[PDB]
Structure formats: structure tokens, C-alpha cells
Structure 1
Amino acid sequence: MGAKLAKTLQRFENKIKAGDYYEAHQTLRTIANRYVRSKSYEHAIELISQGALSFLKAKQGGSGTDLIFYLLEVYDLAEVKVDDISVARLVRLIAELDPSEPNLKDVITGMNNWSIKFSEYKFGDPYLHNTIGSKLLEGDFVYEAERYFMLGTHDSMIKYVDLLWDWLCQVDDIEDSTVAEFFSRLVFNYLFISNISFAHESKDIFLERFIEKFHPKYEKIDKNGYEIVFFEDYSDLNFLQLLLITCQTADASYFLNLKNHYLDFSQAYKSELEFLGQEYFNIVAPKQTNF
């Protein structure tokens, strides 16, 4: 079995380098279906995965995409649990995917859905998301990448700061409220999943780039271990930085005082603040519109 699989895999990738795509695809699936029929999942998994890899490496999205789905079907049929090995196979396949593949999003969704059903993560495995995010970004699917990175690993956080930084830079006419539209995303998103570490690191990396490129007037304020890069021309950034630390204290008073001083900002981020006040200050009362 082990010596037979290896062999045929060459006569398959031989039909692929020869041009015989139909032959290669048809033969492999029927044979794979046989393993599945006998519940020899493991065997089918390696065969299918390997076949999908070669197809994608040969720029054959059609077959490649199809096999990925087939693999996933087995994954759910074999109740393959989410772990390094299980994720690895998908990561290795996602790397060979063409950013323009008409199925991209579907492929991604399928893989992630699997991770959700066979893991304790309500939105999928973190590591897996790190790979998925990069793929989506290659097809200009920014918004989709942002979400996955948000729910990714430490590397995702870096690629999320780069996604937001390269976007801010793309803006021809920058303004005081423009830098906040990007920066705020980091503070809010990470604060929702309560990842203070990522919220602080993403903030530091983004605020330092902003200082080395735009050269805005500022001065670092330090107090009891905490620091707040006070920008002289960006009130939005000052407010946002205070909001972060405030949530960390989980003290109602501080949250109310910060909002009362920045009435305008309190209405721009109405909904966002309402949530933060419920997750960090146990507030049930809705957010009263200032304007």
C-alpha cells in the first residue's frame, strides 16, 4: 500500500507534465474514491492532497481547486480533528493557490469551516487564518484579509499593520481624521477580541511609522509605566490611545470622563464605545447620541 501509492504518484505527475490533465484527474479521483469507500481515509488524504499540489503547481486551478474540495469532504468524512498536521496540508495547498483563482474565497471558506467544526475556535484555527489572510490579500480582497488577520497569529498582526499602513499611504490627500480611520481599526478590533498585547504592539508599530514618514508634532507622555504618544495635530489618535488603556483599567469612571471630554469622538464611535462600555465597564444603558 505504502509502496504502491508512492509509485502511482509519479505516473500521475507524469501525465501532468505531459499535458494529460483529464487522464491525471479522472484516474486519481476514481482511485481515491476507492480508498474512501473502504474507509482508508489516511491513504486518500495523502493521494488527494498530493494530486492537488501538483495541479496547482502546474497552474491548473480547475483540477487543483476541485481536489481541495474533495479533500475537505474526506476531512469531514474522516472527522479529521484540527491540529498541526491537519492544518499543514491546507497551508501547503493555500501557498500554491493562484490569487486570481475564481474559487479562492470558496476554497478558503471550506478550509476554515472545517477548522471551526473540529476545533474549539468559534471562527477557526488561528494559524490557519494567518495563511488564509495572506492569500486573500494577494487577490486584493483587503476587507476579507483584515478579518482573518484580526483573528490570526502574531505574524498576522504584523501583516495587518502592513495592510493598514500600505492603505494609509495609498491615500493621496491625507488629513488629520484620515490617519485615525486606519489606526482606529487596530485599537477597536483587537480590543473586541480582548487582545491587549496585540493592540499595544500594533499601535506602537503603526504610530512609529507614522512619525518617521509624516513627521507630525508630538511628545511622548509617560506615567506609571504607560506611554501615550501625544500628537499635536491628531486629537483622534490621542483619544484612541487613551481609550485602549482605559479599557485595561475596567473602571467605569475613567471611561465616562474620557468620553465627556471628547464629545465629538464619542459620537463618531458611538456604537464602538457602546460595546467597549459593555465588555469593559458592564454598562447596559445604550449610548446616548451627543449630536
Structure 2
Amino acid sequence: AKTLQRFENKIKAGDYYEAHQTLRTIANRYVRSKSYEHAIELISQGALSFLKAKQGGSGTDLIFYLLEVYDLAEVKVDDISVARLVRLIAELDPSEPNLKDVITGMNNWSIKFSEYKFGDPYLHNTIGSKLLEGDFVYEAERYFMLGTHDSMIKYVDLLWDWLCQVDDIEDSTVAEFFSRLVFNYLFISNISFAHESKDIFLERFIEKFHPKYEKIDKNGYEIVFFEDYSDLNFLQLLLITCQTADASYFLNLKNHYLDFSQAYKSELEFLGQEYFN
């Protein structure tokens, strides 16, 4: 209680070490009395501040401590629950040596107290952006993968901005980026995202590289046929083919693109397991 004053004092005084623990000791006291709500607020708040003061250590510690309480008080995953953690994620230094740790800590909690096997979507969007701040592209790609619509937007931009950065682009180069969107979203069975991500990416590819093409439409579906990117064509046809779940179409598409069936061996194999039983 009255001690609270004396420590925040040490904070706004230049004694980070002092304040961090003093708070923790007082915090552990709240938990001891099972006054969880009080603890959650104390710890969480104190962390954010340490992060704002650029005190990576102390801050990261409290963040975990909060999670520890979260799992102790069995805090269910909801808006207010995710909010606190999200708020903290924004103050985390993308260079924090234990970034991935923090990310995992909360995501784990999001899973244990939710019906999502991979964590809460909303929380993912925030986490994804953070990982990218640390140039952890691959790690980010996955979180956005299982995120919200915004995650999709950042995901397509993540790949696109990467494709452009390429100095020695190639016919197969474009496929390396595009295929990811199609496959990844086809793995989590998110046809809506697969189509929208594919739409934004293909349009940007066309308005920048100006590849000679002609749109082929039929029954409502459209395939942006590229005269110099056979890979892109195959990948687009694969998307629609998975929607039909028809074994014949799957076999026909692969028999025509023998090399692409070998270049996307593993992927096509799983697709036959998910959309063809």
C-alpha cells in the first residue's frame, strides 16, 4: 500500500532495479491474497511503463509474471484479456533478446483458454506485426496466417514487399511468393482469404511488372492467364481446383503441369489429403 508510493518514486527517480522488484514483491502479495484482479493491473501497468522507459529486462519480466498470474487465476481469453497483452506488445523492443519468448507465452495462454488450437486471431494480428519489426518474417507469416483480415493485408504486403526487393527476379521467382498465399490459406481451409490475398497480389504484380496477359472468365471464376508465368497459372488453377474437391480435376491439372507437380510435390500431396480425402 503506502509502499507503492516509495517505489514508483524510485522509478521517476532513476532507480529501475529498485522499482521493478519492489513492485513484484508487492504484486506477489496480491496473488498470495488471491486478489488476482489487483495483481493483473499492477503487474501489467508496471510492465508497460518499464517498456516505455526502454527497460527491456524489467518490462519483459513483468509481462511474463502477468501471464503467470493469468494462468493461475485461469483468466479466460476475451477482449479485455487480450487487450492488456496487446497493449504491452506495442511497447516491446523488436530487438528484445526474448521477444519470441514473450510472444509464445501469451499465445500459449490464448490457446489454453480458448477453442483455437493455435491461439486467438485478434492477438495474432498484433503479435505478427511485432515479429516483423524484428525482421522475423517467417515467424510473422504464420501468426498473420492465423490472424484477422488485417493480418491478410499485412501478409500479402509482407510477401509482395519481399518479391519486389528481389534483384534477380525470375519466371519461377514470382511463384515462390504467390504459391505461399495459395497453399498456406488452402491448408487452413480459408478459401475467402486465399482468393482475396491472391487478388491483391496478382493486381499489384500486373500494375508494376506489366506482364502480357488476358483474363479468362467462366461461370463467375477468373484466371489471370500469364503468357510468361506458367507457375502463376498453375497456382491459380490449384486454388479453384481445391474448391471443387473433385479428384478428376486434381489429376487433370497435375498431368498437364508435370514439372509443377514435381516442384510442388509435398504441397499437392497434402491438398489431395485435405480436399480429396
TM range (shorter): over 0.9
Aligned length, in residue pairs = 277
**1:278 deviation in Å?**
1.2
Which ranges in structure 2 are unaligned for 5 or more consecutive residues? Answer: none
Q: 1:7 to 1:227 in 2, by over 3 A?
A: farther
Distance 1:248 1:225 in 2: 13
Distance 1:265 1:144 in 2: 27
User: Which of the residues 233, 245, 248 maps onto 2:243?
Assistant: 248
Distance 1:218 1:8 in 2: 71
Distance 2:88 2:47 in 1: 7
Alignment pair present for 1:176 and 2:171? yes
Secondary structure of 1:243's partner?
Answer: helix
Secondary structure of 1:220's partner?
Answer: strand
**1:73 deviation in Å?**
0.5
TM-score by length of 1: 0.92
**1:13 deviation in Å?**
4.2
User: For 1:147-176, what per-residue CA distance to the aligned partner results, in whole angstroms no more than 9, with x for missing partners?
Assistant: 111111110000000110111011101110
Secondary structure of 1:227's partner?
Answer: strand
User: For 1:178-205, what per-residue CA distance to the aligned partner results, in whole angstroms no more than 9, with x for missing partners?
Assistant: 0000000000000000000000000000
Secondary structure of 1:216's partner?
Answer: coil
User: Which of the residues 193, 196, 201 maps onto 1:201?
Assistant: 196
**1:8 deviation in Å?**
7.2
User: For 1:49-75, what per-residue CA distance to the aligned partner results, in whole angstroms no more than 9, with x for missing partners?
Assistant: 000010000000010000011001100
**1:11 deviation in Å?**
5.7
**1:15 deviation in Å?**
2.7
**1:245 deviation in Å?**
0.4
TM-score by length of 2: 0.97
Contact kept, 8 Å, 1:13 with 1:54, in 2: the verdict is no
Secondary structure of 2:223's partner?
Answer: strand
Q: 1:179 to 1:9 in 2, by over 3 A?
A: farther
Contact kept, 8 Å, 1:94 with 1:135, in 2: the verdict is yes
Which ranges in structure 1 are unaligned for 5 or more consecutive residues? Answer: 1-5, 282-290
Secondary structure of 2:116's partner?
Answer: coil
Q: 1:27 to 1:267 in 2, by over 3 A?
A: same
Secondary structure of 2:90's partner?
Answer: helix
**1:17 deviation in Å?**
2.7
Distance 1:258 1:163 in 2: 29
**1:14 deviation in Å?**
3.9
